[PDB]
Design a binder for this molecule. Structure first.
Ligand SMILES: [Zn+2]
Ligand SMILES: [Zn+2]
Lengths: 108, 108
C-alpha cells in the first residue's frame, strides 16, 4: 500500500494553508479504483477519492498537487474560477509545467 | 484514419488568429506514434506531430487546444513565457479544466 504518513501530512498541511480547518473533522482521503478519473470528491461527505491504480505512478509533488486540486474543488465548487486558480498557483508556482508533464506521464 | 477536414480547419484558423500566416507554407500536421507525448514539434521543420494512438480519444475541443498549444511553442519557443500563457488562456479560457480532464481521460 501507499505510505499513509506522507498522505496524512499533505492532507493536514494543505487543509491548513487553504483555511479549510473548519472541515478537518469531515475531510478524509479514500483510495479505491476509479473508472474514468485520477481523483474525485464526494461533496456531500467531503471525501477525496484517489484512484488506487494511479497512486503508485505519482511523484510526491504530484500527490501534493492533486490533493490541493481536489481540496480547491471542495472549497470553491465545480469550476476553476480566478480565486481557485490563484490559490492553486500560490501552492504550486510551477503548476502549468506540472500539468503538461502529468498528461504525458500517465497516458495508457 | 482521423478526419482530416477538422484538422485542416483548426490548423488554418489557429495559425491565422496567432498571426503565424507567414509560416503557413511551412507548418504541417503529421500523425505518428509518440513514445511519451500527446503531441510535439520539430521547430526546424515547423512540423506538429500528433500521437497516432491518442488522437481517436480526443474531443474536438481537446484537438483545438493541443494544436494551439503546439503552435504557441512554434511561435514563442520551448517555454511558457507570460505572452505564451496569456495567448493560450485567451484561446481557451477553460484551459485548466481541459488539462485536468485530459489527465482523467488518457490514464483510463
Ligand atoms: Zn508547452
Ligand atoms: Zn479541477
Amino acid at each position: 500500500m501507499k505510505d499513509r504518513k506522507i498522505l496524512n501530512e499533505i492532507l493536514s498541511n494543505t487543509i491548513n494553508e487553504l483555511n479549510l480547518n473548519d472541515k478537518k473533522a469531515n475531510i478524509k482521503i479514500k483510495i479505491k479504483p476509479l473508472k474514468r478519473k485520477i481523483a474525485s470528491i464526494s461533496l456531500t461527505n467531503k471525501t477525496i477519492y484517489i484512484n488506487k491504480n494511479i497512486l503508485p505512478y505519482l511523484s510526491d509533488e504530484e500527490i501534493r498537487f492533486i490533493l490541493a486540486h481536489e481540496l480547491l474543488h471542495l472549497k470553491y465548487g465545480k469550476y476553476h474560477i480566478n480565486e481557485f486558480e490563484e490559490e492553486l498557483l500560490f501552492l504550486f508556482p510551477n503548476k502549468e509545467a506540472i500539468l503538461f508533464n502529468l498528461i504525458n506521464k500517465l497516458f495508457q
